[PDB]
Amino acid sequence: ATNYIYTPLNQLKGGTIVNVYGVVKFFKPPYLSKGTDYCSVVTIVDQTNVKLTCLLFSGNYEALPIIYKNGDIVRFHRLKIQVYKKETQGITSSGFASLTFEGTLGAPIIPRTSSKYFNFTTEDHKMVEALRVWASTHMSPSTLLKLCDVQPMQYFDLTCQLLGKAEVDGASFLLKVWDGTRTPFPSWRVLIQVLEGDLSHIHRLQNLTIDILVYDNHVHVARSLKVGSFLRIYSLHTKLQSMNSENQTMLSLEFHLHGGTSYGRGIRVLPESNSDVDQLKKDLESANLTA
């Protein structure tokens, strides 16, 4: 018989492999580490109010938890528990598997995973609903910032559609994206020599598109993106520039995806099965009719 036991986050012990359920408080989307496998960091919490940071490694990008935003609920199978610098941490073990669900009350319960075969019972539904109830009061809803509401200098997660790509200087790469709304100040424009995508469409959209410069480790990822796909760019940084390189006063909003993975800086492609994409498509349609 198949009997999966889930251990509360406050009853975890080092030197053991377990199964856990939790709400995502923080996460770094999958990224190619300096090693062999892709890496993803996920900090989860449950009713015990105890936090657990998990370091997940895999040779396949999709084998890692398919998390799209904080608040998502995950189920982890074959998670090893160990101590690192007196601090308990979770790490991938052989056969590691995960299921991810939306974390909002009343939301559809559709398990997301790359696994071809996986257990899913009424006990899982109960577990998910139980975490949604808990989170509804111990966490904040999900809230999607449009470009028209970005502030002069802040970090934020942007849901958008990719319209163009362009090499710059190897250390950085350009992504031209849009979400159907206009920034409060015109986007800066990186000098391009190269740009792949619908040039006429881009030109017709004018300031509806913005220029995003990604650096270092983010470059190869940006280079592989398919024009026209939908993306979530985590911890994108806006910076209002009031002085150009020639010492002239002006106003332009820059968008930078800085090197490193701190605070989840990264990019995840959103499938058309994502609810946030359905909403985005309608905004794009509306903006397109007027442009």
DSSP 219-265: HHHHHHPPTT-EEEEEEEEEEEEEE-TTS-EEEEEEEEE-SS-GGG-
Long-range pairs for 121-124 at CB < 8 Å and ≥24 separation?
Answer: 123/4, 124/75, 124/99
Is residue 136 located within the same domain as residue 172?
no
At position 147, the amino acid (one-letter code) is L
Q: Which domain holds residue 7?
A: 1-144
CA distance 260 to 54: 18
Q: Which resolution, in Å, applies to this structure? A: 1.8
212, with CB counted inside 10 A (0-12, 13-18, 19+), is: buried
Q: Are 91 and 78 in contact (CB under 8 A)?
A: no
CA atoms within 13 A on the CB side of 196: 12
CB 165 within 8 A of CB 179: no
- Whether the CB-CB separation of 132 and 125 falls below 8 Å is answered with no
Residue among 128, 109, 209, 132 nearest 165 (CA)? 209
Q: Are residues 132 and 225 in the same domain?
A: no
Using CA atoms, how far apart are residues 24 and 7, in angstroms rounded to an integer? 16
Contacts of 204 (CB under 8 A, 6+ apart): 291
Cα distance between residue 209 and residue 185, in whole Å = 12
Indicate whether 170 and 118 sit together in one domain.
no
Same-domain status, 84 and 171: no
Q: DSSP class of residue 286?
A: H
Last residue of one domain, picked from the residues 102, 121, 144: 144
Same domain? For 29 and 97 the reply is: yes
Q: Are residues 123 and 35 in the same domain?
A: yes
Same domain, yes or no, for 161 and 286? yes
DSSP state of 180: S
Q: Are residues 149 and 289 in the same domain?
A: yes
Terminal C-alpha separation, the chain: 61
Cβ neighbors of 232 (< 8 A, separation 6 or more) are 68, 69, 157, 158, 159, 267, 268, 270, 276
Residue with token string 């080092």: 14
Q: Are residues 110 and 194 in the same domain?
A: no
Tell me 287's DSSP state: H
Structure method: X-ray
Residue 132 in contact with residue 47, Cβ under 8 Å? Answer: no
229 near 161, Cβ under 8 Å?
Answer: yes
Amino acid at 41: V
